[PDB]
């Protein structure tokens, strides 16, 4: 989030004489490591004969 400014008047007593407060903000974006996998079964005799 960005902060925001305002145009202000000059006054000791009126609300339009007060400078606004605002906030910047930051958030988290995250890497989570997840696993992708497979198992490929084959007969030992077929691997020997190939």
């Amino acid at each position: 989030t960005l902060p925001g400014a305002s145009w202000v008047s000059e006054s000791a007593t009126e609300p339009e004489g007060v400078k606004p407060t605002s906030e910047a903000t930051w958030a988290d974006r995250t890497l989570v490591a997840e696993e992708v996998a497979v198992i490929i079964p084959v007969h030992e005799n077929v691997v020997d004969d190939a």
Partner: protein
């Protein structure tokens, strides 16, 4: 330049203020003289209120 003075918050209202101060004392030596006790070293000239 940061203080609150009266109702005015100086920093937000973008104001500044010259505080001024002094510390003073007064005494009158209205003691005894060679003439007697409780003698006052002051005389006054005043108008009539009429």
């Amino acid at each position: 330049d940061q203080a609150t003075v009266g109702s005015i918050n100086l920093a937000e209202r973008d104001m500044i203020a010259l505080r001024l101060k002094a510390r003073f004392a007064y005494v009158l030596g209205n003691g005894a003289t060679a003439v007697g006790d409780n003698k006052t070293p002051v005389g006054a000239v005043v108008p009539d209120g009429s």
